[PDB]
Amino acid sequence: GPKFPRVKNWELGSITYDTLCAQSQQDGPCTPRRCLGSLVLPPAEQLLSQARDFINQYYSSIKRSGSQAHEERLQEVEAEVASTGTYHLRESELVFGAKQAWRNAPRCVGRIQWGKLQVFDARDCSSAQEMFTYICNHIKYATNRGNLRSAITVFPQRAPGRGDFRIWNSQLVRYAGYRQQDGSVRGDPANVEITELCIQHGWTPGNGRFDVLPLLLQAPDEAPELFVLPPELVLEVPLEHPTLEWFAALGLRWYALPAVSNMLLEIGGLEFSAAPFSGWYMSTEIGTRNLCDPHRYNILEDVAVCMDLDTRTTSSLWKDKAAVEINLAVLHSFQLAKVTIVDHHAATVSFMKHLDNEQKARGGCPADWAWIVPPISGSLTPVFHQEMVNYILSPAFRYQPDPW
Amino acid sequence: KFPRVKNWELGSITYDTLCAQSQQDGPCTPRRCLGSLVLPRPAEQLLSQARDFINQYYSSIKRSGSQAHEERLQEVEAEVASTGTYHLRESELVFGAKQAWRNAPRCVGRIQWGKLQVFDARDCSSAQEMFTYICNHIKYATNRGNLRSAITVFPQRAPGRGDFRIWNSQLVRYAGYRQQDGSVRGDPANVEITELCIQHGWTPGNGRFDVLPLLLQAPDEAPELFVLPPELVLEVPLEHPTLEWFAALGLRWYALPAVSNMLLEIGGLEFSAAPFSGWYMSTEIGTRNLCDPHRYNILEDVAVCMDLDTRTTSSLWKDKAAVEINLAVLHSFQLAKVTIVDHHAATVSFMKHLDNEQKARGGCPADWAWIVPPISGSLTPVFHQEMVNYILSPAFRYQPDPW
Numbered sequence A: 001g002p003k004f005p006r007v008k009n010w011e012l013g014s015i016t017y018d019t020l021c022a023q024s025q026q027d028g029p030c031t032p033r034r035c036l037g038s039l040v041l042p043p044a045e046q047l048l049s050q051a052r053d054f055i056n057q058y059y060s061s062i063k064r065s066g067s068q069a070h071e072e073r074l075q076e077v078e079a080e081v082a083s084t085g086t087y088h089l090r091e092s093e094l095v096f097g098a099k100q101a102w103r104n105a106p107r108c109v110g111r112i113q114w115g116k117l118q119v120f121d122a123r124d125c126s127s128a129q130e131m132f133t134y135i136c137n138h139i140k141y142a143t144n145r146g147n148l149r150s151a152i153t154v155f156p157q158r159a160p161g162r163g164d165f166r167i168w169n170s171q172l173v174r175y176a177g178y179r180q181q182d183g184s185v186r187g188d189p190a191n192v193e194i195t196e197l198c199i200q201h202g203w204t205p206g207n208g209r210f211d212v213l214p215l216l217l218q219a220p221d222e223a224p225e226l227f228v229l230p231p232e233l234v235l236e237v238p239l240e241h242p243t244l245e246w247f248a249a250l251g252l253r254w255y256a257l258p259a260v261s262n263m264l265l266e267i268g269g270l271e272f273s274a275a276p277f278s279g280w281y282m283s284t285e286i287g288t289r290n291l292c293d294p295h296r297y298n299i300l301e302d303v304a305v306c307m308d309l310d311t312r313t314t315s316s317l318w319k320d321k322a323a324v325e326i327n328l329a330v331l332h333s334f335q336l337a338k339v340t341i342v343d344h345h346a347a348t349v350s351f352m353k354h355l356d357n358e359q360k361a362r363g364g365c366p367a368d369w370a371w372i373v374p375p376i377s378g379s380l381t382p383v384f385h386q387e388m389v390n391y392i393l394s395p396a397f398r399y400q401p402d403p404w
Numbered sequence B: 001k002f003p004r005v006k007n008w009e010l011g012s013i014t015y016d017t018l019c020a021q022s023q024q025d026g027p028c029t030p031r032r033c034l035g036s037l038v039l040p041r042p043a044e045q046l047l048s049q050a051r052d053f054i055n056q057y058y059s060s061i062k063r064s065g066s067q068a069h070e071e072r073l074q075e076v077e078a079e080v081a082s083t084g085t086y087h088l089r090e091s092e093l094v095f096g097a098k099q100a101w102r103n104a105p106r107c108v109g110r111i112q113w114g115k116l117q118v119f120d121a122r123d124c125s126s127a128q129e130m131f132t133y134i135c136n137h138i139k140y141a142t143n144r145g146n147l148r149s150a151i152t153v154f155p156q157r158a159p160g161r162g163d164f165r166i167w168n169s170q171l172v173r174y175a176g177y178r179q180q181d182g183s184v185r186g187d188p189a190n191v192e193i194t195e196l197c198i199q200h201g202w203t204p205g206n207g208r209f210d211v212l213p214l215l216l217q218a219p220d221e222a223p224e225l226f227v228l229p230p231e232l233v234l235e236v237p238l239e240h241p242t243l244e245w246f247a248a249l250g251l252r253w254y255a256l257p258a259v260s261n262m263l264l265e266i267g268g269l270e271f272s273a274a275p276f277s278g279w280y281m282s283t284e285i286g287t288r289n290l291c292d293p294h295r296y297n298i299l300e301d302v303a304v305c306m307d308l309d310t311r312t313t314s315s316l317w318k319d320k321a322a323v324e325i326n327l328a329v330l331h332s333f334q335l336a337k338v339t340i341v342d343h344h345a346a347t348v349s350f351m352k353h354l355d356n357e358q359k360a361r362g363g364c365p366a367d368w369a370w371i372v373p374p375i376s377g378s379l380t381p382v383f384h385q386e387m388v389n390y391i392l393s394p395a396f397r398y399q400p401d402p403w
């Protein structure tokens, strides 16, 4: 009947219809001819319509839709655009947009927490040194000695004919990856390029597998400046296994704070090129992807050898067994150290609760199935059996190309 | 126009040009992706699908634009112009069947696509005859545990009349008996088909692993019930390589995965009954069939036997039991000398298939959500591989349940 996508859960037999997708003003990469769902990378008039839409979202969310203050704010926005080509958000408009951008993020499984975000307003920042102060404050607040708190710091928006604020690092905490004489990599192969950029800009590098990178921070029309994070600020967790005693001997570790720093936060047509945001980890991020991806730390074989598994044949499931233990090491070590973490079962249960909340509140929830389903034990989690509709809503976080 | 397709593990890139051959729209639009949805929500027409297919066939035998190609195009035209339909030659049917498998985006086993035994059952005129054909197929495919891909093709759909149909979703399925207490003994996925069998006269067993009888339907007739001779249905008792108590769970599975409810479309003609079989990938049994909450749902039972801490999600007791259940499937099939493939071997060979199809055809339609296995996703190479999904013809299609 209903003229909207029907959405089914195949575990429970239950059906909903996504009406929220009607609100989408931006096209994805799919067409009736072909689905491109699995691809990782997909003027005054334009801005004004995006701005009007954002302001309407803001006044709806406070239930003052159509009211005098709403119409006056609309008028204020177009007058400002009419005379400068841009406009500026009020403090509470920014807080709302930031939460909404997180709420709208299709690839994030942690969205049950969306209303609980500390928005640090840093739109007064005017130097790379001050970005560093702001960032250090973010890290201290967010880390909270292991009791992690979601946060985002917002630096000044893109301006006509003026350079961007950029953090060059993809996260505020990353391990160095050192290209070796034998072609191999010591540390994190993901970070080879950023490591080499740091050295070029005068960083004296280490030679470990877990050297915390410095930050490369760029203020408008300036070369980026290098800043070392004081080690007492970067909380890390040494990895041990609850029953396999040798696991600690591997000297594996990971940091507490997952903090994305290279994404663009778009709100009502305004673009915040530097707006680092953080939460807490889902255990599979560390245990499965970071430690077991072949193009990352690639430790599966080492761990299976320690576990004395038959690594010569696929059908011993040595890969699956070792990956489980590594993931269990991640959970146990964070729990022991009292650093917030969530396992993939609890995270996905909570995402299902979030889907239900959003069905009631907005009549849908944009979600990217391939990213929501965890990289181990997929169908053991409830999200695997849940159909999802993926579409772009604004405010949004958006990928941006590296500035170098 | 042509999408770039990247492997994120290796950094390699291709471009899919094959997708331009799609003539059938899927469920997505620029406004929203519906790629995760399980189901989709005239003379000149048939003639053009028929032409294109015949063109595909003569192309495949490198006789494109020859005399035989010309005269065959004319036969099809002449037949459609007079009767509103036409008929395939056996070799064309064989080609079209292999192509529908090749073109199937949810299938991880497509490296095998050229190795398919095709039984022509288009001279079938009764449920009885359907049954004999089905028994031949099973015996052939099973081959004492050395499984061989096969398909049997029953008579095409005709505008005048009802369809030949196999009511069962697979040739071999375990019954699900709805109990007094609303629980299900056996397989919850097969409650409805079990009740239909009983209603049409089947005396039911009471076990967890009772092989269902077949309900076969010839055009515009009530379906008929046929019991498969137990000697034809190969089964594998499940035991564990080290965990001695597992064998006592009394668990088992059938050797032969044989889809019997899909429609095969070739050159515009529709084959409403066309059962096909290969061999299992171990996650289908070990993860989905035994571990789904709405299936046999044995996870907790296994975890408790393993004496795991089931009180909390963070002990990863589900992940651990799931791995052992999969191991037990692999080991038991190996022990019983019945063909099986694990999810690492299958996805590695699927990657090879992708490369083969890239050179052969300029692409390969693939549904990522179905190609990536249900456990240990990112541990297989397919996780890190971008995929383009689209509908090519010949094709297997979903069709409504006949009741």
Ligand code: HEM
Pocket (backbone or CB within 6 Å): A098, A102, A105, A107, A108, A109, A110, A111, A113, A117, A150, A151, A152, A277, A278, A279, A280, A281, A282, A285, A342, A347, A371, A397
């Ligand atoms: C509160 C705890 C959180 C958890 C457990 C969580 C979980 C996750 C996970 C597992 C992913 C996929 C990441 C990957 O596989 O690389 C993700 C993606 C994402 N999340 Fe969260 N998240 C949390 C908080 C946040 C916050 C605070 C924000 C921003 C305000 C956010 C926004 C995003 C965005 C934009 C993506 C997509 C990133 C990309 O495409 O690179 N999440 N989340």
Ligand code: HEM
Pocket (backbone or CB within 6 Å): B097, B101, B104, B106, B107, B108, B109, B110, B112, B116, B149, B150, B151, B276, B277, B278, B279, B280, B281, B284, B341, B346, B370, B396
């Ligand atoms: C040779 C061994 C084969 C293996 C290991 C294999 C593997 C698989 C797997 C794991 C699936 C997904 C099943 C699920 O999750 O329900 C699948 C789907 C499928 N396969 Fe295969 N396959 C094989 C042979 C075949 C053959 C012989 C055909 C037809 C001639 C075929 C056509 C299909 C089709 C049409 C689907 C999608 C069915 C649906 O949407 O329900 N495959 N395959």
Ligand SMILES: Cc1cc(N)nc(CCc2cncc(CCc3cc(C)nc(N)c3)c2)c1
Pocket (backbone or CB within 6 Å): A040, A041, A258, A259, A260, A277, A278, A279, A280, A281, A282, A285, A399
């Ligand atoms: C706030 C937050 C919390 C959390 N638990 N995880 C994250 C994920 C961070 C993360 C880690 N590794 C990789 C990525 C993906 C980076 C990335 C790369 C490309 C090519 N396209 C994208 N859209 C995104 C993101 C963020």
Ligand SMILES: Cc1cc(N)nc(CCc2cncc(CCc3cc(C)nc(N)c3)c2)c1
Pocket (backbone or CB within 6 Å): B038, B039, B257, B258, B259, B276, B277, B278, B279, B280, B281, B284, B398
């Ligand atoms: C030939 C073959 C070989 C193999 N190894 N596995 C299979 C899996 C068959 C199979 C088993 N259970 C369930 C399904 C899916 C059934 C199915 C159900 C619905 C609602 N829509 C669809 N498109 C498909 C398929 C087939």
Ligand SMILES: C[C@H](O)[C@H](O)[C@H]1CNc2nc(N)[nH]c(=O)c2N1
Pocket (backbone or CB within 6 Å): A038, A039, A040, A370, A371, A372, B008, B383, B384, B385, B386, B387
């Ligand atoms: C090719 C595929 O789109 C890609 O590997 C995706 C799949 N799903 C993912 N899901 C999450 N959460 N994170 C990822 O990096 C990926 N990678």
Ligand SMILES: C[C@H](O)[C@H](O)[C@H]1CNc2nc(N)[nH]c(=O)c2N1
Pocket (backbone or CB within 6 Å): A010, A384, A385, A386, A387, A388, B036, B037, B038, B369, B370, B371
């Ligand atoms: C909703 C979701 O698309 C659905 O659960 C799919 C996911 N991937 C799958 N993949 C395979 N191979 N088989 C399946 O049944 C499913 N189920």
Ligand SMILES: [Zn+2]
Pocket (backbone or CB within 6 Å): A030, A034, A035, A036, A037, B028, B032, B033, B034, B035
């Ligand atoms: Zn799509």
